[PDB]
Every structure is written in C-alpha cells, then in structure tokens.
From a paper:
The preliminary structure determined by this approach served as a search model for molecular replacement using a higher resolution 2.15 Å native dataset. The crystal structure revealed a two-domain architecture for the 453 residues of [name] (molecular weight of 51 kDa) comprising an N-terminal domain of mixed α/β secondary structure and a C-terminal β-barrel domain. The crystal structure of [name] contained only one molecule per asymmetric unit; however, a tight interaction with a second peptide chain that was related by crystallographic symmetry in the P6322 space group was present, revealing the homodimeric organization of the enzyme. In [name], this mode of interaction results in a large buried interface area of 3741 Å2 and creates a globular tertiary structure with a total surface area of 17701 Å2. We observed two substrate binding sites per homodimer, which were characterized as pronounced tunnels in the surface of the homodimer structure. The N-terminal domain of one chain snugs into the open pita bread fold of the other chain and thereby forms the walls of the tunnels, which end at the active sites located in the center of the pita bread domain. Hydrophobic residues predominantly line the tunnels and at the base of the tunnel, nested in the center of the pita bread fold, was electron density consistent with a pair of metal atoms, which presumably mark the active site of the enzyme. As iron was the most abundant ion that was identified in [name] by ICP-MS and TRXF these atoms were modelled as iron in the crystal structure. Six residues bind these two metal ions: the monodentate Asp297, Glu406, His371, Asp307 and the bidentate Asp295, Glu421 ligands. In conclusion, one monomer provides all the residues that coordinate the metal ions, and while the second dimer approaches the site it does not directly interact with the metal ions, which leaves an open space above them for substrate or water to bind and complete the coordination sphere.
Numbering used by the authors:
A (entry chain A), B (entry chain A): 9 to 445
Write the structure that this text describes.
Amino acid sequence: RKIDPSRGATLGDGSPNDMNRVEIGPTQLAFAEWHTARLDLPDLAAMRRFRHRRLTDHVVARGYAGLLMFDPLNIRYATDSTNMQLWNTHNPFRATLLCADGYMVMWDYKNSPFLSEFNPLVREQRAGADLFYFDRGDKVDVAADVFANEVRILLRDHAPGLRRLAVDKVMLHGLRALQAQGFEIMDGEEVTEKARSVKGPDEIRAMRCASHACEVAVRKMEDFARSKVGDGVTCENDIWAILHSENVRRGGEWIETRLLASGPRSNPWFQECGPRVCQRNEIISFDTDLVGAYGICTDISRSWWIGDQKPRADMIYAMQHGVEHIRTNMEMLKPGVMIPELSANTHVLDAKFQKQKYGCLMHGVGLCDEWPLVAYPDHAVAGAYDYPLEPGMTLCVEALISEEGGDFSIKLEDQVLITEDGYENLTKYPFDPALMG
Amino acid sequence: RKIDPSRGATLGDGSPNDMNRVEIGPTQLAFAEWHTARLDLPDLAAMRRFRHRRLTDHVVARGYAGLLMFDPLNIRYATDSTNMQLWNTHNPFRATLLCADGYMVMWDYKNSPFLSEFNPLVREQRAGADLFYFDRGDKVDVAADVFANEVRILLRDHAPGLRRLAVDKVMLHGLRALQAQGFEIMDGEEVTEKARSVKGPDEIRAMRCASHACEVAVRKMEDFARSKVGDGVTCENDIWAILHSENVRRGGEWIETRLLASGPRSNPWFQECGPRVCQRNEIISFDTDLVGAYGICTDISRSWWIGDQKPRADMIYAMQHGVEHIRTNMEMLKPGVMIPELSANTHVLDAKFQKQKYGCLMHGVGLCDEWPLVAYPDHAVAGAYDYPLEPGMTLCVEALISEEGGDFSIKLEDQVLITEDGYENLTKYPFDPALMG
Ligand SMILES: [Fe+3]
Ligand SMILES: [Fe+3]
Ligand SMILES: [Fe+3]
Ligand SMILES: [Fe+3]
C-alpha cells in the first residue's frame, strides 16, 4: 500500500513509498502543491549525509573527541530523527554522540529505539541518557555515571587519546559525571550553530519546499481573516488557528511563538495572540516563526489591513518604510561581507521608529532561528560575530516599524539565501496592497 | 471595549475585562462552554499567590538562598507569564529568580519587559539573562558575569548569608559565572517538581476548565474522523489538525508529542502522526499530551474504531483489558500511599502485553507531564520516589495494551485528582462503544 502508487519503491525524496512506514514527512497535499509549483524534492539520504559530514568536519577542525547533543533541534540536525520533539525541548530524555571519526550513537527513549533506524548514519540505538528529576527521582547520579562511562568507552574507541567533549546543553548531574570520566567539556552550541550555518544543495531544496507550504498556509489564514473579520466573534486565536491546522495538514511540526496581534495590541510588539475579537479597519500583524515541512523553519512576517476604508496615512508610511528597510538591507547580502559590516551599514530607520525597533536586522534560519544574529549598530557587540557570509547561508531580513506609544506596528520579514554572486529572496508572499497604498 | 460587556471591571477569573489588555487567556468560546458546564473559574491572582507561597516555602524548607529558573515551564509556574514559550524551551533568553524572602525578579527578552507586569509578585523586570551562542556569539562570558553579579547582589539583600542557589537548568557559561560569585549550585528541578506536585484550590478549578476544553476539542476531532475516514484522502495529520485548531480556539498553547497513529502504525507505540491516509475498519489510537487553557496540561489517551464491521475480538479484549488496568490502579489512589506501593500493587497485564507496556502506570501532570513517575515493578528504582501521595496531587493513569509483533495498540489514559478521602477522576471522555463491545 503506497503513499504514491504512481511511483516505485521510493518517493521522489528517496523515502520509502509505503503508507505503513515508520517515517513521517510531507503529506500528499504538500507533495501535490510542490509538483504544481515545479519544486525539486530534497534527496533525504544525501541531505542527512551532508549534515553528518559537515558536523563531523566541525568536530575534527576543532580537535575535539566528539560532540554530545541533548537539544532536540541539534539532534534533528545530526540525525533527522524526531521523537516527541516539544516534550524533548524541556525534558532531556535523548542524546546523540558524534565521535571524531564520524561514528554516531543515539540514546533514545527506553521504549522507542526504532525511531532513528531509518538513518543508518545512526550506528547504535541505546537508552538511559535521561538524567532529570522527573525521569529518575532521587536516583539520577547512578544513571549519570552509567551513561558517562558509555561515552568514555565510545570515545576511547572512536576518538583515542582525545579529552575534549563539546556538549550543547546538559543537566548538572550529567556534567559532573562526564567531568569525572576525565572529559574537558567544551561549548557544543558554537559547534552546532556554525555547522547549521551553511545549508547543502538538498537542505536548500527542502527549504524551498517548506517555504512554499508555509506561504500556502498563510494565504489560507488570510482568506479566512478577510472573510470573517467584522462578524463580532472571530478572535486573534481563531485566525491563528488556521496557520496551525494548515501547517500540520502539510506535514509541519509546530509554531515557536504567539506573534499574531490585532488592533492596538500590536504596539508594543511581542504581545501574544489571544481572545481579542478582531475588527474591521484594523491592522493585523503577525510573524509565522514556523517549523514546517521536512522540519524546516519558515520565519516570515506580514501586516494586513482588513476593512473597506483606506488605512491611516501613518500606516501606509510605516509599511512602505519597512519594505524599504528590508529591501535595502537585503541588497547588502553577498559572500565575504562580515556580519558587523551588515550592522554598520544598515538602512537607518526614522527617528520615531528607532526606540522600538527589532532586536536585530537579520538572523540565521534553518530548523528554527539560528546563528548568526545581526544586531543594529547601537546594540552590536564588538568581537561577537567576526565572520564572513558564505554561500548556502540562509537569513531572515527583519523590519519592525513601531511608533513609541503608538497605535499599531508594522512587522515585515523575508527569508533569503546567500548564493555565489549575491542573494536570492526565497519569500514570494505579497505585501498588503492597501497598506502599500 | 470589554471581553465580557455582561460584567464589570474584571472577568469571572479576576483578569481585566478589556479586549485590548496585554494578558491572554481563554476565549469567549471557552468561557461560554464552561459556563454551560457550570464550572467555577479560577481566581488567577489567588492561584498565582498560592504558587509563589508554595515555591517560596520550598526554597526556605531547604535552607537555600534562592531558586533561579530558566525552564519556561518553571517560569510559568512561578510567574504565570508566557513569552514565546516554545522558542524559549530551546533558546534560554528568560530567567526568574525567587529569593528566600519571596522577592522575585524576571530577566525577560530585551524588548518585552511588559509581559510579566500583570503579576505584581514579579517585583522587577530586567534583561540580559540570555547566555547562549545564538544571542551573544563569542561574547557570552562578559554577559554571564554581569548577570551573575546581579544575582549575587539580589541575594545579599534578600537572602543575606546564604550561599546555596538551586538552578533548574543553566548554560555552562552561566554555571561557571554563578560559581565564581561563590554560589553553591543545587538541583532546581527537585525544588520545582516538588512544588508543582501539589495543586491549590484555584489550580484545581483551572484544570477542570482546561480538561473540559481539551475534551471538547477531542470530540471535534472524533466528529471529523468518523465523518471523513474512508474518503481515501484524509490522513493522520488531517485528523490531528482538528485537535491543534480546536485547542487554540479555546486559548490552548501547544501539543507536546505527535502521538496519533492509525492502523498498523500504532504497534509498536510511539510512531508519530503523519501522512498515512486512514482507512475504514482500523483503530486510530492517540494521546492528547496537550497544553491547553490557562496553560494547564490535559494528557489523555483514547483508541477509536471507525468502520461498519465489528472490530476483531483481540481489539475488544485489549480495550477491555486497558480499561480494567486503569480502573484497578486508580482504585489504589489515596493520600498516604507511597509511590512504590503503587508500583508493587499494580494490576498485572497479561503476558502478551508485558513486553511492550508503557514506561509507567502513572505520572504527575500540571503545566505538562510532571513528577512523580510511577514505574511498573520490573523497572521501579528502589529509593528513587520514597514519598506519600498528598491531597491536591493530580496524576494521569496509563494503559498501553500492545501485542509484541502485533497489529495495533490500545492506548488509554485518564487524569485524576487526589482528594482527602481518595481520588476523583477528572476525565469524562467516553470509551469507544464498538471497541468496548
Ligand atoms: Fe520571525
Ligand atoms: Fe525573525
Ligand atoms: Fe499521555
Ligand atoms: Fe501520560
């Protein structure tokens, strides 16, 4: 029983053409829409090999024994295997070890070792890396020592004579157990963030797919908003719910924030989506901050005017100003440009917008928001991000246009790829023609 | 402009009756359904005071200076303030300090100090507790020292002469900075898990509300499944999407797992919801694992038979066996019973079910899955959970009924409150009458 009977043993992305397979991934709906958009599918095996080769190279360039990962998103990067991802972000039951020779082990939940079997780069599946109070009570230490010894033995074999173990984040008991085995603990996030920083050819294809799925879901949310707002019952949550459903229907995973806000609730920014019944002749501003198809994040922001009357002239000005902000900064994007050059040379927002502008003008994106962060010059920390842009980096370009004490904020954001010769904006979503004038 | 014009300055839960308020919470839809079910609303101010008094008492009983929390769910428990919760679970930008005298400080995202203002128990709002590589690059240490000094100064004033600082989870750089200020770092999760372990009168009311909202959302998912399955397009994700939407429409927050599985994909258990097109005459088994209204978790599980033909006799047997398992174990619930007594005296699953049974027979629940864990005797760790049940504890009672190499699994789960005299099952959701026979 096939997911695509109109194909052989595999899907166009190399995954098993079997409706009864363990693996999840995009839905028929999403595949259909991408075929129509004529988007090349990612070869998942190749994508996974690329990530593992790159991550392994990073461990070796640093002279480390290995990299031990407890962050679910780092685990995803290294193995592409999901397991109760959201539960995992705050209950650290999983671990992945990447040894300097490329050898990779997964400690998974005790009763689900099969979840990472589809990726033969994961050489072993074990249990017992769960070193928190909920899972072990007053008996975490015994287990911490068992686990740490396992790590020691693995790296004696796969990284003989190396003492430095990068760890992304670990529970205190785990840290001390690892130290008691003789490991010098290094910052794992500097390793993973820099590895994640450059996408390979299949990661690009994947992001193209995810981005499209996200945009279709956003359009569905817009359709619903423009059709319901004014009925005196449809709230911010009702609208936002369309983005949740339509992301899931395309094989998406979750939404990182609650950044949808209507009317006066959009200034100051960062107020959360909730029960406010929306109204005609108001701006709705939102940011997708979305983990979608193939586990790829689409992080884009738009502001919408729903109403028959024209918007106030300051709304139109703010909108056009955000668009100019994004498009100007985007033009700076080229390989070899340093991050702080981007900080220095940012397009300058008007005075009434400086105080409440966004925490950065750009940031990385992959499986979620990622390194680097490109802060505005008045916040840039010297020596913090002294690195060049490289081809394959994918960044979100931001604009928050928010008057101090103001009535509304414009939030705009596009997702862009760095190429050999410059950049390529991956976002196709239109700007609201009424807010653009 | 009021959220409930049919009321004064406040909602029935004490929150501001203003559609333009910063605070989120349940929707008109959810409030309507709870009024009809005649459910008393939680007094939020009182709920928040109860949690703070209890958490503070725990810090003091231990002789600690304070408790520093970076886990978003612990922050929620202490302050009830949300901010990009899911982003926060894996990018630690927030911190809450609870001093031994009750004094409480929030370090929030640099541009959103207002988010915790609605809770005057949060005495200060600062920034700069964000000590990870994405937010700070190669300059985390400078900031780690600034933050750690702030903590030192606060506890000199609010906990003079005390050196022990419980921390739930912290980044390595933060840990060393705190140690360099002279703090003895203790396990924060033993503090928070034990505080969270007992709910007050308003937390109970809140959970009653959340549980109802979750059940209505599940019914909506059932309606949709029973009406669409067989159409040859409706997949696991399509069905699951109804739970996402309908939780959000009631002010819910997120779903911790992907535990919905159709047909043969339900054995082994822990396979994830995905693109498999569902079919008539198959079991769908699922677990809500849901963070709903008022931020309260409803964690329940059901199995459904959709089809005109009767289910196989082993499915009916498995179902009845799970129900017996849950109802028998539930009968053990009383204050003063020790956790390992529950382990020892569990109802015994049949032989064909022992190998693949669930990781526990019971666990705590509050803002998510919580301490304690009640493991089956063949996994129980002696001395790990030597504690009595107390009134106000709220536990989920589990049954996974899964034949080794089998065709399907039955997953059932109810959420229960411990009372003075025994227990009270809070779950009202029916069992599938076709699977019950
Ligand atoms: Fe964003
Ligand atoms: Fe962004
Ligand atoms: Fe559950
Ligand atoms: Fe459970």
